[PDB]
Each structure stands twice: as structure tokens, then as C-alpha cells.
């Protein structure tokens, strides 16, 4: 049965840990958001064919440019993440994440994921951005960034509402099969 290593990368603002917990437990953690998600694996069926999906978090390593790539070798698919309500995280896809992932894993598929979809229409979030002369990241901005990096898919999700979340991981697996 096919084994799949999926590494999740991106800025601290994406909520990587929260993404993975919400995905694996089928719920936003709400009460308390754990800082630790340990390397995880589970059998899922995609398009019939069952698969063993391995998920590794990278939260904590955002400042350690030489430690991050210790997790990269033999990855089958990367999720390069940014938060839809952080323009700086979206630009870091280009400035930080894509270059290192390419440098170490030139032929590994990338899914581009925008997290925090539920905040893109939230008044307070929008206003807080307006005060910095910014706006949330919209769909065509994601598509264009996806083309620029060679991403096989651009997907948007919320850990909070579950919207698009199960799809992210289905598609990670499809990008390997």
C-alpha cells in the first residue's frame, strides 16, 4: 500500500499546526490551539485506491534556514501555505518557501494552499488590514502565484469551517498518484 510523505511549509501566520489538527481530528480545536502536531500517518482511500498519508508539520522552524531542509528529502508532495488575510505570508511564498523547496526538491509536486478563508470576509480582519494599506489575498492572486511557482493546484481552505480542507489533502495525494 503506497506511502506518501507530505510536508507542510509556510509562515507562522498560516496556522500550519491548526490546519493539520483540524484536518486529522475533523474539527477546529477551538478551546485551545495545540502547538504540537507530531508526524502523523493514516490510511485514506482516494479515487478507490487506498493510500497511507504521512503529514509532517514544520512549525517552530520558521527562523532556522538550515534546519528546515532536514525535513525536505524524500518528500512526495509539499503544501506551500500562506494565510489569505496575511499579504506578507503570501509574498513569502515567492520570497522564501518556493526557492528553498525547489532548491532541495526540484521535481516534487507543490500544492499552493491559502488558509484562513473564513477571515477573508470578516469586518475586523478587513479593517485591521485597511489600516495598514492592505487587503486580503483574492482568488486570482492565488492562481497567478500558483502558476509562477509551478504548483499543480491552488486551493483555499478554512480549518475553522472545514471549507475546502479535506480537498487540500485529497489533492495532495492525487498529485502523487
Amino acid at each position: 500500500m503506497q506511502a506518501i510523505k507530505c510536508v507542510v511549509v509556510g509562515d507562522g501566520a498560516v496556522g500550519k499546526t491548526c490546519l493539520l489538527i483540524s484536518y486529522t481530528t475533523n474539527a477546529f480545536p477551538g478551546e485551545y490551539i495545540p502547538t504540537v502536531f507530531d508526524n502523523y500517518s493514516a490510511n485514506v482511500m482516494v479515487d478507490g485506491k487506498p493510500v497511507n498519508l504521512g503529514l509532517w508539520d514544520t512549525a517552530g522552524q520558521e527562523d532556522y534556514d538550515r534546519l528546515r531542509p532536514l525535513s525536505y528529502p524524500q518528500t512526495d508532495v509539499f503544501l506551500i501555505c500562506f494565510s489569505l488575510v496575511s499579504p506578507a505570508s503570501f509574498e513569502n511564498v515567492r520570497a522564501k518557501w518556493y526557492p528553498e523547496v525547489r532548491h532541495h526538491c526540484p521535481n516534487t509536486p507543490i500544492i499552493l494552499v491559502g488558509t484562513k478563508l473564513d477571515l477573508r470576509d470578516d469586518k475586523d480582519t478587513i479593517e485591521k488590514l485597511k489600516e495598514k494599506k492592505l487587503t486580503p489575498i483574492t482568488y486570482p492572486q492565488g492562481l497567478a502565484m500558483a502558476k509562477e511557482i509551478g504548483a499543480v493546484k491552488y486551493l483555499e481552505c478554512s480549518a475553522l469551517t472545514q471549507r475546502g480542507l479535506k480537498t487540500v489533502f485529497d489533492e495532495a495525494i492525487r498529485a502523487v498518484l
Binding site: E31, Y32, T35, V36, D38, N39, R66, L67, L70, S71
Partner: protein, 179 residues
């Protein structure tokens, strides 16, 4: 209440880290050193390169660090001092990180499926590679937990600042030690 969830997590995850290193040593390492099985010439007598100083990392956590973290369970606001006290022991993660690229290539180029057959036979969800990244993960995670304690503990909380300082310095020093 928030400082309590963070301390609980610190502890639950410390226990799991100790259990994870123990499994790594007693399955993947033990099959190499035992003399129960045929070891590829590619890796023979090269367990020091594969596992780095993970034994010594494990002894620290399992002999000392987890018992001391437990003692701070009702003193979450003081736990930064635990890191200060044991700062020197964390220097072993510098050695471990330095070695890890050499470890990974050695397993790649020379172990073929030795460790995968061990994994299958023992029925482990985690591969040797999944276990061997854990020290890298754990040493970059303590600073996240301490930062979270800073957001919910008073100015009688430079018993977090100095801890966090140490736990930012260790991974940076490890990072800067890489080629």
C-alpha cells in the same frame, strides 16, 4: 486556564518525545547492534552516523528533563528556569543537527530497505526517517511553548524570558553549525 493547557501540552508532548526516542533506539538501533540480523555492508558499524548522539539526547530527557518538567507542573510561570538550569545539556542538539544530513544520505545511498523491513516487522507507523527528524522538531518547539506562556503570564515572568532566550539560542546555534 490557558497557562495550564500549555503546561499540560508541554508535559504530554515531552512524554511522547521520550516514548518516541525509546522506540527508535529499541527497534531501529537495536536491530543494528543486536547481532540478530544481516546488516548491509553499506551501513555496517555506521550506527554512530545514522543515529548521531540520539542515545545521549534520550538519556537526558528520560533520566532528567521530563522528571524536572513534571516538578514545574503547578508552576507553569516558572518553567523557563527549567531550561536555564539544563541549558548545557541542550548543546547536544547542535551535535545532532550537524550530523543529520550525513545520516540521511547514508540511509539513502546504503541501507536499501533494511530499516523499512524493520518497520514492517515491528508494525510501526513511523519510519526511521520520521523518528530521526524528531529531535530537530522538538528542539524548535520548546521556544513556541514558552512564547505561548508569555502571552498569558504576568511580569513575574522573566522566569520565562531567560528560558526562551536559551531555547532560541540552542536552535540558532544548531542552525549556524550546519554546513
Amino acid at each position: 486556564r490557558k497557562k495550564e493547557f500549555i503546561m499540560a501540552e508541554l508535559l504530554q508532548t515531552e512524554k511522547a518525545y521520550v516514548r518516541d526516542l525509546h522506540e527508535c533506539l529499541e527497534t531501529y538501533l537495536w536491530e543494528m547492534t543486536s547481532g540478530v540480523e544481516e546488516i548491509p555492508p553499506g551501513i555496517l558499524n555506521k550506527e554512530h552516523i545514522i543515529f548521531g548522539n540520539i542515545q545521549e539526547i534520550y538519556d537526558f530527557h528520560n533520566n532528567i528533563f521530563l522528571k524536572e518538567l513534571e516538578k514545574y507542573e503547578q508552576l507553569p510561570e516558572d518553567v523557563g528556569h527549567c531550561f536555564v538550569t539544563w541549558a548545557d545539556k541542550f548543546q547536544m542538539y547542535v551535535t545532532y543537527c550537524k550530523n543529520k544530513p550525513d545520516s540521511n544520505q547514508l540511509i539513502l545511498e546504503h541501507a536499501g530497505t533494511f530499516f523499512d523491513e524493520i518497520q514492517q516487522r515491528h508494525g510501526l507507523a513511523n519510519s526511521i526517517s520520521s523518528y530521526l527528524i524528531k529531535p530537530v522538531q522538538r528542539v524548535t518547539k520548546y521556544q513556541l511553548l514558552l512564547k505561548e506562556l508569555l502571552t498569558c503570564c504576568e511580569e513575574g515572568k522573566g522566569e520565562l524570558k531567560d528560558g526562551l532566550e536559551v531555547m532560541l539560542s540552542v536552535p540558532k546555534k544548531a542552525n549556524d553549525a550546519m554546513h
